[PDB]
């Protein structure tokens with residue numbers, strides 16, 4: 001035996017397709033541990049989840065655990081450099097993050113497989129000897145203030161806290177998880193709190209070993225990982241902390257039968273119906289709430305959503321069980337509202353209860369349970385291999401809930417059929433404990449309350465008793481039926497033998513005027529799945545704002561019309577994705593290959609013989625108007641990025657231009673557009689997965705054939721296959737475009753240093769430079785200078801051209817952000833000069849590892865190929881080519897590069913900046929900048945400049 005280990009679990013049940021190896025165990029200090037050994041893996045990973053979270057904040061210091069989560073990254077006793085951790089990761093091809101829910105704090109990272117031990121050692125120190133440096137705390141508190149500022153004007157975050165503020169304020173549920181500058185500094189200072197103590201106190205009280213789960217994944221054997229984990233983690237001290245419980249629901253009697261009217265930020269209409277329920281988590285083997293979710297949330301014929309959608313009152317619905325914390329859960333049903341639907345909220349809920357009643361009337365249904373259990377068993381067997389960071393983070397979390405042996409299956413497999421639990425949860429979905437929330441702009445001015453944290457305007461009301469009764473006496477309604485056998489359930493899982501002529505990259509197997517078929521049968525993953533991707537080209541999908549609107553509308557109407565039929569396939573692991581592009585349309589069909597050709601044929605056939613329902617047209621149109629308008633409520637950085645897309649692309653229709661042109665969109669006009677669009681096309685497809693050359697040609701040909709038979713599609717001409725170019729910027733020039741965000745009181749900035757076209761050479765100069773500056777940018781602009789929560793840098797790539805970019809969202813003005821990036825950029829040339837050839841070579845090696853990391857799942861491989869095909873570079877072997885070339889570069893290559901294209905006095909510096917100002921408008925040396933040329937009109941700017949070439953295909 002071994003003193004450090006309390007036990008090794010028995011065999012960990014995995015899918016029989018999972019080649020990875022697993023060992024579970026419990027340390028002597030009580031920490032639950034999963035070990036994953038994957039000798040193939042390119043990146044390694046570890047995560048730790050602690051069963052404590054914002055629900056355990058001192059009442060008097062809101063968001064202390066979320067703050068503590070930020071601080072652990074910023075220095076321990078053993079590795080005291082503020083950024084040892086994030087720099088060690090950067091230089092060895094890793095990344096990291098954390099999050100805090102009300103009951104968990106979850107920390108994970110990935111790294112190159114050679115450096116797991118180094119990564120992990122630095123990591124353990126978080127849980128033993130964090131420094132909470134006084135100077136780090138002062139600074140990092142602003143990052144948290146930004147995190148919340150971001151969220152303040154977000155409609156989902158406000159609704160989330162508003163729920164917490166209307167249950168029992170005495171309950172921990174009512175707490176503010178995020179914290180801000182106010183709750184973390186201003187106010188604790190006023191009240192003579194030393195926050196460094198309070199962080200040391202909270203860390204020491206709750207970061208106890210008995211409350212921790214670790215997962216590690218690496219190339220090492222299971223024995224090697226064991227020794228490793230034991231070594232680094234046995235010294236975490238066990239304080240035997242009792243795990244927090246919340247037996248009492250935060251919605252007590254007086255919180256039930258309430259109605260709330262709420263004003264949103266975006267122009268949206270929504271109804272949130274919600275009942276309290278007990279903790280259902282222990283019933284995971286039978287899962288009563290999933291069963292009722294499957295049903296109430298169903299979207300097929302017969303379903304609740306269906307009648308709500310035919311009465312033209314709602315558009316979408318979600319319902320099912322919602323997590324609470326240990327002790328309570330909720331059951332929700334929320335829908336959005338047509339303008340008509342808003343005036344029928346009473347009737348909508350009554351339909352809701354008529355449906356619930358139908359379920360009571362029919363009793364539990366084993367055949368539905370069998371169906372659910374079967375889908376999940378299939379889902380489990382053929383689960384795609386996950387990226388290791390996500391996987392460890394996830395499993396660390398759930399080690400807290402399941403026996404070691406079941407950690408892999410517990411969330412998937414079903415075992416027990418429980419008509420009793422089903423009937424019991426069903427007894428709680430009653431008018432006597434309902435909550436109703438309506439979110440609409442029409443409550444503007446009519447509100448009397450304000451939510452402290454986010455500022456939400458709202459009104460609370462008792463639901464009239466006769467209203468409750470009307471709901472209590474819900475009749476059956478003959479429009480509601482249980483769903484019938486799901487015919488889309490796959491049964492054929494045969495993995496076709498690997499062909500004689502199969503290749504490692506996709507092959508151009510068809511090159512006609514109508515279509516260009518790229519194909520690869522799967523040589524890696526061997527699951528009964530495929531992806532079938534299609535670009536359809538029409539110059540009419542974007543010839544003008546009007547047309548762009550129509551392509552959009554057409555596609556939403558089609559998706560809406562297929563929804564009832566398609567929902568079945570989606571439960572059966574077969575889904576599709578269909579949207580309009582600036583080039584025509586896109587279509588992806590993904591999942592188990594068995595019934596895949598059925599659904600595809602149904603889609604094309606529909607596309608080509610489409611009949612629009614006047615009622616449905618009118619609603620989607622209204623919903624689209626709002627959507628375009630709602631862009632004004634998007635975040636300042638998302639705005640900045642948007643403007644820069646509009647400014648650098650040859651052709652691009654502005655949200656305003658679409659909004660305006662959307663009124664000339666009549667039903668007559670739409671009916672005429674469809675056959676026009678569908679009459680001349682080109683198709684470029686990539687077919688990839690468990691399929692053969694001959695089946696692939698058949699599928700492609702069936703698509704074409706359907707379009708001819710029904711829309712008379714003829715091929716498009718080679719010269720009409722027009723791709724849009726990027727604006728070419730003048731050597732030494734600098735432009736600024738300035739706009740205002742009228743909703744958020746932060747500002748946004750995008751700075752673009754354009755370089756040259758994409759070419760093996762020019763590609764890797766940019767990438768290495770980005771790699772070297774990646775963490776220092778984060779570390780300088782955020783950690784040190786605390787300019788904002790959002791601080792991004794990296795390559796930008798569009799229409800075959802490229803360049804470096806910075807994105808910041810900040811409280812300080814853009815002219816200010818400009819200058820500190822510039823400051824930073826000098827710091828950088830200064831660093832490349834001072835760095836060891838070996839430091840230089842580490843960065844080369846990290847980019848190397850990132851670039852070469854093998855896809856772990858089909859979808860991921862497809863994506864890499866598709867990027868090659870949509871960009872028309874067709875460079876399928878690019879990763880080996882570009883990497884070979886990378887290893888050839890030297891410090892002087894990169895300085896020359898920075899001196900030519902990037903330094904402030906660079907002979908070919910091409911700088912464009914988007915400044916997005918807020919609602920309302922020591923440190924390194926910043927260089928003196930030129931008078932920028934302020935862009936007045938986006939069209940003029942474009943007319944007056946060269947356009948770039950397009951990239952030659954490989």
Ligand SMILES: CNC(=O)[C@H](Cc1c[nH]cn1)NC(=O)CN(CCCc1ccccc1)CC(=O)O
Pocket residue numbers: 290293294295296297298299317318319320321322323
């Ligand atoms: C398993 N149950 C079901 O089948 C249905 C499916 C459905 C589709 N359309 C309609 N209903 N239920 C659901 O999907 C929804 N609920 C709640 C979401 C709670 C949430 C809120 C914000 C942020 C993170 C999660 C469960 C879930 O997410 O699985």
Ligand SMILES: [Zn+2]
Pocket residue numbers: 066070147
């Ligand atoms: Zn955070």
